[PDB]
Amino acid sequence: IPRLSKVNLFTLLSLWMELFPAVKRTGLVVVKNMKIVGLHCSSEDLHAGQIALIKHGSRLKNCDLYFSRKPCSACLKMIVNAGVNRISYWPADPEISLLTSEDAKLDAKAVERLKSNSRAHVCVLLQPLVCYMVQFVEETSYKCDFIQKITKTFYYECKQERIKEYEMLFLVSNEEMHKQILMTIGLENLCENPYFSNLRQNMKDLILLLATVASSVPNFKHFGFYRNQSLPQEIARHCMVQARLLAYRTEDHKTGVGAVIWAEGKSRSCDGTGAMYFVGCGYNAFPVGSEYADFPHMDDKQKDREIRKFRYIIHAAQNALTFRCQEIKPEERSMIFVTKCPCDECVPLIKGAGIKQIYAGDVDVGKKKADISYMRFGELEGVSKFTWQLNPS
Amino acid sequence: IPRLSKVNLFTLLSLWMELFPAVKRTGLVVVKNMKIVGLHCSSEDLHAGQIALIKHGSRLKNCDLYFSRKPCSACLKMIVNAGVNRISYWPADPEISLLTSEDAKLDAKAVERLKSNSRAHVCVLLQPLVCYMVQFVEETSYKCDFIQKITKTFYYECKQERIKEYEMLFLVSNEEMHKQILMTIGLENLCENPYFSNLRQNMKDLILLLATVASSVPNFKHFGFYRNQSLPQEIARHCMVQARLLAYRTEDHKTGVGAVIWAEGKSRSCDGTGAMYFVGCGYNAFPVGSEYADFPHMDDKQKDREIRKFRYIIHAAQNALTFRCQEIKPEERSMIFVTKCPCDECVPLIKGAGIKQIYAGDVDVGKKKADISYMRFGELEGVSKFTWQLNPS
Amino acid sequence: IPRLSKVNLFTLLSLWMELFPAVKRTGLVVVKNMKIVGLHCSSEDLHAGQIALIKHGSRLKNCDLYFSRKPCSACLKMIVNAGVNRISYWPADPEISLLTSEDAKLDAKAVERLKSNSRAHVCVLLQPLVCYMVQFVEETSYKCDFIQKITKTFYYECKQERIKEYEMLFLVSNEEMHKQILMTIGLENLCENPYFSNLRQNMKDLILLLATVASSVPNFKHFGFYRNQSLPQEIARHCMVQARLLAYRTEDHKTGVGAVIWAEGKSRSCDGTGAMYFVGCGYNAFPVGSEYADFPHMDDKQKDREIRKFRYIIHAAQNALTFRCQEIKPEERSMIFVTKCPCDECVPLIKGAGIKQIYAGDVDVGKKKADISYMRFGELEGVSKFTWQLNPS
Amino acid sequence: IPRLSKVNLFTLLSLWMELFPAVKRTGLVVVKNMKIVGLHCSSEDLHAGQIALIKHGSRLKNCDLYFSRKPCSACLKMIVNAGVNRISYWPADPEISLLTSEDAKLDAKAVERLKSNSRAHVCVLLQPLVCYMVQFVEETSYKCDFIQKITKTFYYECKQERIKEYEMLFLVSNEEMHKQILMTIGLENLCENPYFSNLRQNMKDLILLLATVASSVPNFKHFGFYRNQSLPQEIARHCMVQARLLAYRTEDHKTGVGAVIWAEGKSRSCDGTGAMYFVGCGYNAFPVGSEYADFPHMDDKQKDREIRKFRYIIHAAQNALTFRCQEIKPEERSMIFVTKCPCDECVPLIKGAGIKQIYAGDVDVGKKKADISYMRFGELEGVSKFTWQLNPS
Ligand SMILES: Nc1ccn([C@H]2C[C@H](O)[C@@H](COP(=O)(O)OP(=O)(O)OP(=O)(O)O)O2)c(=O)n1
Ligand SMILES: Nc1ccn([C@H]2C[C@H](O)[C@@H](COP(=O)(O)OP(=O)(O)OP(=O)(O)O)O2)c(=O)n1
Ligand SMILES: Nc1ccn([C@H]2C[C@H](O)[C@@H](COP(=O)(O)OP(=O)(O)OP(=O)(O)O)O2)c(=O)n1
Ligand SMILES: Nc1ccn([C@H]2C[C@H](O)[C@@H](COP(=O)(O)OP(=O)(O)OP(=O)(O)O)O2)c(=O)n1
Ligand SMILES: [Zn+2]
Ligand SMILES: [Zn+2]
Ligand SMILES: [Zn+2]
Ligand SMILES: [Zn+2]
Ligand SMILES: [Zn+2]
Ligand SMILES: [Zn+2]
Ligand SMILES: [Zn+2]
Ligand SMILES: [Zn+2]
């Protein structure tokens, strides 16, 4: 199966964070040592870069920041002063809108000057997807737990709606306006063909993949996460889409599973996500630093259990707990969103970590295979469980 | 005086952690930069490795883990994924008991496959003790504050009882069964003599040392820690034995002192120690990085006070506070267990650190020497003091 | 404009910390990677070094400690055990007073022995000031916001009073007594001229600068910080003087701004500052790692706005929040002291960081320049504001 | 078998380097990353420290230097300027003889002052040997290739001669004289019992071991290395003793083999070894970073060839070539001294490395075991071979 790249994952996550349910809004992904340490969105008061500064301080040192729009000079100077390594940005209309004029152009010039005189590398890191990536994402999106649950109780029309909305929000349809933006933000190297058309096509492909993933957890009928107090359904869908986007980084050759751990702070926060802050993320993969041939990749179809992937595969929730950027606070409401039903090996870890709520798929609940089972999720006590289903009330 | 090795200290501490008062139970010592950063025991729900993962996350990177039993494949894959440097284990029956069959053998095979394809080094690191180590430990154990206090108000009989119990728990008396276990867990290099007999003798010697140290703080008559609410006497004895085992790492040539700082969390935890979590450890030694001849080692017998050890020796409590892996929470109950009465330059440090309770011996209480005194412990206010004594009730 | 050096800033800050409003009292500055991570004062129970040990633990590794007095052997051994890099001290009467005898001399000998056999470098790092530095500091202090506010509603007389008091507290007027102290504390290389006279003159110049800066925020008439509950006026003045001292590290060629963030803990603390602990510090400067010609240094007088400093200069509050050594706890009272009224791009950052109180001089409040404005401080909601002012009561 | 420690090996090698065939003469061992990178001796013009400076330059950074005598102030200042980590010295009469007066005392005072004000750690690092190290060394020395070859064609009498000579050269028999030396060189912590007597006994034990090893390759009955031009027999014996001392660092449990590679430069050199300079050293051991139980330690007595040490043991010559500090220059004469006959997997490596001459023992020449053979040494062409033997003329 095709694998989404780390940088394209971070770009997609930054654009999706710009869509977190609450000068243009900006989503930001803070990555350290190729691990996500922050998911932020611009609020009405502060930009994503300012919020990242407030949240991280000097911990932004040697960090990679992925912005859904090019940050303003005020954000860029603070981010550079904090000591980050790379600032990758989505080359649409920047944070200070160029489609609104002289002040925005002056801000762009100041951003260029800051970039030219800093050790931080400000760049556009989005790369083309493989030829089959979009088709594979669509195939797995129609077949995921949530779409299957709705079907057993529409997807392409919602996907078309998401395509239109996200192409409006993230793309510059007018080629001349996009060329003007790219010239203003110092991307003259991408203003002439075939680089201009290649960049626009790559942006369109990434927007298509994002729309596919977002519609894989659709706002359809009364379907939501139900069955101690549930989150607003929009935020639950957004976090599930985050985990679903992570599921495409899987090293498993058959099934991709993603997991995001979020927590709700007691007090007010400066972030655009409100009291909710990102805690951890993960996908199912073999232990860090493993080559392709290091561990068996076969499923139960292989006769010898010793050469099956199950004893060696790290699950999405296990990776999310392992590489968490925040501690699970017992007094806070903490939620883990998993695209697949947590297995009997992961549920005790979630319970022991103190995670209060699990938002999960429901397809594999009750399955009992030789090396993996799903019996402890149905009978789990002390942790609230929310599954994709029709609203009982 | 003979000095206990760091690796043997960690092995003994993992074996003792397996005995913390509440698939076989497993103790675990997490060490970072040759400093202990975690003491864990398997609970009824989670193994020691899973608990260490939950408690540390990616902070296990480049850490040394010391297991009382060889971890299972599920624990090993998560520990390796976290990036640990070195997993040492006690070569008795592993976590998945081989003395119960096919599932345990398959788990051992998966553990060996994980070891072969990972940068983490899975090994048996226990070393032979010096010829005089056990005799010296026995001599100092009979002469310690607690045994002397009981005598001033039995030790060898309790020593024999602990020897029998710990040889039952930690050793495989049958040589053929031990050979089978070693072959299963991939220790064929130690299955034939003299390496098999050397390994068994080293294990027996370490178990004898552990029984000696555990008997030095015996469950005898109604003796316990008494004089705001005291811990259960079993946990207090266990922590005092931890500090006593640390006391044998001393650089002082005459008296070894050990100290352990523990804290009781307000909320429930996943660990087998309950709400109690390890905060810090220390022993009396010269400042880190000092050579043998760097500082004077003499005592008050030396005429010149300028060439006495007192002004240059770091006390056990000072080292426990310095290299603590956790912050002292003001709202939490925090306990420091010291094998000797805290001195007048340590009591203010304990009080200022916020440690609520001091469990200690009381032989030197009131002693006033030129370079060390014990006057501030008797008159200490704001910190609960628990000494080894008969129950006043 | 002349710039205060980092080592002189830290020496001055340690001397000022010794004067924090409540064996001689000692101030201590803990610096890591040329950033201040701790401001401590000796309490009645514990010395500054012991308090730094309690507060930081192993985080003192590779840290530079700046003491207002030479630490005692008990403090020095624990500090070098913690692994610090440099211990700079003010070469006046040490912590164990030599002007009071045999015990102090023995402590000094033990300190020298600890210094000889440790990798930590114990030294005197104070360096001569720039020739114009004192005159420039006097000129800017007379023209600072607080002195000007008093004038619009004395400074040299208060400066003379501070000169006398601080020369009494920090200098040894008798040359032979100072020579005895220097010989005892192992500074024989500075006991003969011109090095002895040069050291005494450097100390006098630094004391003069400290008196000037402390008089810039005088205890005059009923002037204090007023406008949810304010701090004691002495502590507010002390923190404002800290910020004023930081303002002389500015990279801006016209105006120096300093900011200190402190927090009042809920529970008792071992520090001499009481429940208050240092959170962060900063001054107005260009992004870290910038050369002199990297960014424009001009002001609004320059015609082109693209070559003005404003879009590239990091403000004092921005730097204080960026390089904070502590997290802003929502339940704690947090105060930021800034020598100039916070600008319109700093007030939202202070509000979003959770800082409860802003202490500031408000000369520029209401000013609206092209690239910087002060409109949001006057209308700021949710943050208590205290300005230099006559007491309204 | 007992294992000589790294630091005691380096101390013994520095003492032996002082005896290299040609203010007291000083031998010096330069070690980097626990590997020997230099063997130097004082010449008539330059001291060992000055020669090390000339030879290494800034490569002395973070190096450990082992001196047979405490270096003078001129040597010490240059060595600490070069940035070394540790200077361990043998605590006999220092480089500037204290047994000759005021100038030597002034030099010692300057050395102490340099040590006190430098991050380099000047110390005495010699450790006590295990209680049976000397007996094992004597047993293996009587049974070595050279002594056995002498017997098949005395040892204890030569051993007594070496004991007397080396106790005269390296020890201070007069206890009061040694106390005076130790006080002068700032070792007052080792001037009173039991530390004084312990240090003297440790020095005596190390001298006894050195005499044993040196007599294991004795100057006896015109025996030497014979069979294109051989070295002077004294230098060949000295290098063979170097390799023999390295042979006691072996990880093999039965047979210890050592190897030293030296090269004769074409031009004049400042070293006391003349044109000869140290190239590399090694002993037979398992691959670097291996635990005791990592690899099989068994020999041909074990039935299964897969669990024998031979396929996993790195030979002495292989380690000497691997961790060489100098390149083998084709135009220079190169000599490898190995305490055992080179095996069939070592001779091709020596030939391919360009080593011109092999000085070796010859007891195993012609032996052909299953996993190790000695057939290629007898028929080796293009490399001169010198064996312990009667002089043919
Ligand atoms: N809570 C879980 C459960 C599973 N996984 C990952 C790791 C598992 O190796 C993979 C599932 O692999 P299977 O071969 O069992 O896949 P399916 O469940 O899709 O298989 P099937 O439908 O054939 O039963 O998903 C995960 O990350 N988190
Ligand atoms: N609270 C304490 C007290 C002491 N120590 C350590 C450091 C001291 O140097 C050592 C005790 O050394 P003494 O020479 O004082 O030994 P004793 O306690 O045995 O004294 P005495 O000979 O009077 O019985 O123990 C410690 O770590 N913590
Ligand atoms: N809250 C603030 C406000 C300003 N500054 C810094 C930014 C600039 O480096 C400098 C102010 O520059 P100006 O040119 O505005 O200086 P003045 O205040 O002296 O301006 P004016 O000439 O109008 O009096 O102070 C700061 O650090 N924090
Ligand atoms: N040129 C060589 C030859 C051998 N060795 C080392 C590694 C070998 O593992 C060890 C020899 O191991 P054996 O068991 O073969 O020892 P002996 O040769 O002494 O055995 P025996 O006398 O029983 O034949 O010496 C070495 O370093 N360099
Ligand atoms: Zn911005
Ligand atoms: Zn799972
Ligand atoms: Zn396990
Ligand atoms: Zn003490
Ligand atoms: Zn002190
Ligand atoms: Zn500002
Ligand atoms: Zn010299
Ligand atoms: Zn060989």
mmCIF file of C-alpha atoms in Angstrom, chain C residues 133-287:
data_model
loop_
_atom_site.group_PDB
_atom_site.id
_atom_site.type_symbol
_atom_site.label_atom_id
_atom_site.label_comp_id
_atom_site.label_asym_id
_atom_site.label_seq_id
_atom_site.Cartn_x
_atom_site.Cartn_y
_atom_site.Cartn_z
ATOM 1 C CA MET C 133 28.481 53.184 30.720
ATOM 2 C CA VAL C 134 27.902 54.858 34.095
ATOM 3 C CA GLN C 135 27.156 58.292 32.622
ATOM 4 C CA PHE C 136 24.781 56.740 30.078
ATOM 5 C CA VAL C 137 23.027 54.744 32.809
ATOM 6 C CA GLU C 138 22.598 57.918 34.869
ATOM 7 C CA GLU C 139 21.255 59.831 31.858
ATOM 8 C CA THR C 140 18.737 57.121 30.969
ATOM 9 C CA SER C 141 17.723 56.566 34.604
ATOM 10 C CA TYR C 142 16.938 60.251 35.078
ATOM 11 C CA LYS C 143 14.896 60.094 31.850
ATOM 12 C CA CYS C 144 13.153 56.794 32.632
ATOM 13 C CA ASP C 145 9.373 56.556 32.889
ATOM 14 C CA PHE C 146 9.191 56.479 36.691
ATOM 15 C CA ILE C 147 11.558 59.379 37.405
ATOM 16 C CA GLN C 148 9.821 61.412 34.695
ATOM 17 C CA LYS C 149 6.405 60.587 36.170
ATOM 18 C CA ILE C 150 7.551 61.784 39.593
ATOM 19 C CA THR C 151 8.987 64.919 37.967
ATOM 20 C CA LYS C 152 5.721 65.739 36.174
ATOM 21 C CA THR C 153 3.854 65.308 39.478
ATOM 22 C CA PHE C 154 14.898 64.307 44.170
ATOM 23 C CA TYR C 155 16.533 61.650 42.011
ATOM 24 C CA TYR C 156 20.159 62.582 42.714
ATOM 25 C CA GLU C 157 19.621 62.724 46.486
ATOM 26 C CA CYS C 158 18.066 59.252 46.443
ATOM 27 C CA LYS C 159 20.964 58.162 44.233
ATOM 28 C CA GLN C 160 23.447 59.414 46.838
ATOM 29 C CA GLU C 161 21.540 57.578 49.577
ATOM 30 C CA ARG C 162 21.604 54.347 47.557
ATOM 31 C CA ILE C 163 25.305 54.872 46.806
ATOM 32 C CA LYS C 164 26.100 55.120 50.512
ATOM 33 C CA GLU C 165 23.919 52.149 51.486
ATOM 34 C CA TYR C 166 25.151 49.854 48.707
ATOM 35 C CA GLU C 167 28.801 50.798 49.219
ATOM 36 C CA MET C 168 28.316 49.886 52.877
ATOM 37 C CA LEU C 169 26.639 46.585 51.995
ATOM 38 C CA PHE C 170 28.737 45.363 49.054
ATOM 39 C CA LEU C 171 32.168 47.011 49.370
ATOM 40 C CA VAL C 172 35.006 46.697 51.869
ATOM 41 C CA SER C 173 36.150 50.286 52.375
ATOM 42 C CA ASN C 174 39.189 49.276 54.434
ATOM 43 C CA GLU C 175 41.857 48.159 51.967
ATOM 44 C CA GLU C 176 43.655 45.944 54.496
ATOM 45 C CA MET C 177 40.433 44.170 55.495
ATOM 46 C CA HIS C 178 39.700 43.564 51.810
ATOM 47 C CA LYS C 179 43.243 42.251 51.319
ATOM 48 C CA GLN C 180 42.736 39.864 54.242
ATOM 49 C CA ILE C 181 39.450 38.672 52.725
ATOM 50 C CA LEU C 182 41.014 38.162 49.291
ATOM 51 C CA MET C 183 43.957 36.250 50.768
ATOM 52 C CA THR C 184 41.604 34.046 52.797
ATOM 53 C CA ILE C 185 39.327 33.274 49.830
ATOM 54 C CA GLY C 186 42.306 32.477 47.614
ATOM 55 C CA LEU C 187 42.459 35.640 45.492
ATOM 56 C CA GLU C 188 46.149 36.368 46.084
ATOM 57 C CA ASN C 189 46.538 37.190 42.374
ATOM 58 C CA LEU C 190 44.438 40.330 43.026
ATOM 59 C CA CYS C 191 46.020 41.407 46.334
ATOM 60 C CA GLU C 192 48.742 43.683 44.910
ATOM 61 C CA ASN C 193 48.487 46.733 42.686
ATOM 62 C CA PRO C 194 47.394 47.499 40.034
ATOM 63 C CA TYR C 195 45.126 44.431 40.109
ATOM 64 C CA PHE C 196 43.938 45.137 43.661
ATOM 65 C CA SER C 197 43.086 48.758 42.846
ATOM 66 C CA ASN C 198 41.585 47.754 39.493
ATOM 67 C CA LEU C 199 39.326 45.191 41.178
ATOM 68 C CA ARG C 200 38.236 47.675 43.844
ATOM 69 C CA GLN C 201 37.513 50.340 41.213
ATOM 70 C CA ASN C 202 35.524 47.855 39.117
ATOM 71 C CA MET C 203 33.482 46.891 42.177
ATOM 72 C CA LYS C 204 32.883 50.568 42.980
ATOM 73 C CA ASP C 205 31.759 51.257 39.403
ATOM 74 C CA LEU C 206 29.331 48.329 39.453
ATOM 75 C CA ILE C 207 27.967 49.477 42.825
ATOM 76 C CA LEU C 208 27.509 52.975 41.392
ATOM 77 C CA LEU C 209 25.586 51.569 38.426
ATOM 78 C CA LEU C 210 23.435 49.447 40.752
ATOM 79 C CA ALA C 211 22.661 52.465 42.940
ATOM 80 C CA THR C 212 21.768 54.485 39.836
ATOM 81 C CA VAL C 213 19.372 51.828 38.537
ATOM 82 C CA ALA C 214 17.828 51.258 41.977
ATOM 83 C CA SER C 215 17.282 55.010 42.362
ATOM 84 C CA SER C 216 15.622 55.102 38.933
ATOM 85 C CA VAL C 217 12.649 53.445 40.688
ATOM 86 C CA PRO C 218 12.821 55.282 44.020
ATOM 87 C CA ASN C 219 11.017 54.873 47.325
ATOM 88 C CA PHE C 220 9.982 58.517 47.074
ATOM 89 C CA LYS C 221 6.946 60.273 48.609
ATOM 90 C CA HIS C 222 3.881 58.014 48.079
ATOM 91 C CA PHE C 223 4.807 56.927 44.549
ATOM 92 C CA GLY C 224 4.193 53.265 43.826
ATOM 93 C CA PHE C 225 2.415 50.837 41.542
ATOM 94 C CA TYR C 226 -1.354 51.321 41.580
ATOM 95 C CA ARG C 227 -4.540 51.307 39.500
ATOM 96 C CA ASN C 228 -6.379 42.033 41.364
ATOM 97 C CA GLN C 229 -4.403 42.792 44.530
ATOM 98 C CA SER C 230 -1.061 44.529 44.100
ATOM 99 C CA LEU C 231 2.210 43.250 45.514
ATOM 100 C CA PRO C 232 3.970 44.937 48.430
ATOM 101 C CA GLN C 233 5.512 48.076 46.982
ATOM 102 C CA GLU C 234 9.047 47.033 47.952
ATOM 103 C CA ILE C 235 8.866 43.817 45.911
ATOM 104 C CA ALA C 236 7.291 45.648 42.970
ATOM 105 C CA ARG C 237 10.124 48.189 43.062
ATOM 106 C CA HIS C 238 12.706 45.392 43.291
ATOM 107 C CA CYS C 239 11.251 43.580 40.266
ATOM 108 C CA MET C 240 11.003 46.831 38.310
ATOM 109 C CA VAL C 241 14.679 47.474 39.062
ATOM 110 C CA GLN C 242 15.417 43.963 37.776
ATOM 111 C CA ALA C 243 13.656 44.885 34.532
ATOM 112 C CA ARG C 244 15.520 48.210 34.377
ATOM 113 C CA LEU C 245 18.844 46.392 34.773
ATOM 114 C CA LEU C 246 17.834 44.043 31.955
ATOM 115 C CA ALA C 247 16.919 47.043 29.780
ATOM 116 C CA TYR C 248 20.640 47.905 29.555
ATOM 117 C CA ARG C 249 21.287 44.671 27.629
ATOM 118 C CA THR C 250 19.221 46.078 24.756
ATOM 119 C CA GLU C 251 20.313 45.751 21.143
ATOM 120 C CA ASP C 252 18.153 48.704 20.092
ATOM 121 C CA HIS C 253 20.332 51.768 19.595
ATOM 122 C CA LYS C 254 17.820 54.285 21.010
ATOM 123 C CA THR C 255 15.541 52.816 23.702
ATOM 124 C CA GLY C 256 16.199 49.967 26.125
ATOM 125 C CA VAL C 257 13.255 48.001 27.501
ATOM 126 C CA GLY C 258 13.352 45.261 30.116
ATOM 127 C CA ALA C 259 10.777 42.781 31.364
ATOM 128 C CA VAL C 260 10.692 40.302 34.252
ATOM 129 C CA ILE C 261 7.958 37.722 34.845
ATOM 130 C CA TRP C 262 7.501 36.505 38.428
ATOM 131 C CA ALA C 263 4.851 34.254 39.951
ATOM 132 C CA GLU C 264 3.470 33.914 43.481
ATOM 133 C CA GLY C 265 3.168 30.262 44.433
ATOM 134 C CA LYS C 266 0.285 29.105 46.594
ATOM 135 C CA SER C 267 2.386 26.961 48.948
ATOM 136 C CA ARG C 268 5.357 27.773 51.157
ATOM 137 C CA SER C 269 8.777 27.967 49.516
ATOM 138 C CA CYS C 270 12.338 27.562 50.757
ATOM 139 C CA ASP C 271 13.567 30.616 48.832
ATOM 140 C CA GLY C 272 14.353 33.970 50.397
ATOM 141 C CA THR C 273 11.881 35.501 47.934
ATOM 142 C CA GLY C 274 9.017 33.769 49.747
ATOM 143 C CA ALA C 275 6.238 32.308 47.630
ATOM 144 C CA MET C 276 7.428 34.417 44.684
ATOM 145 C CA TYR C 277 9.628 32.651 42.135
ATOM 146 C CA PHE C 278 11.293 33.921 38.981
ATOM 147 C CA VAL C 279 9.563 32.869 35.755
ATOM 148 C CA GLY C 280 11.273 34.702 32.906
ATOM 149 C CA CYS C 281 13.240 37.706 31.758
ATOM 150 C CA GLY C 282 13.916 39.590 28.557
ATOM 151 C CA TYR C 283 14.959 42.804 26.863
ATOM 152 C CA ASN C 284 14.285 44.337 23.464
ATOM 153 C CA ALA C 285 16.675 42.828 20.923
ATOM 154 C CA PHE C 286 16.840 41.393 17.431
ATOM 155 C CA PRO C 287 16.214 37.649 16.953
#
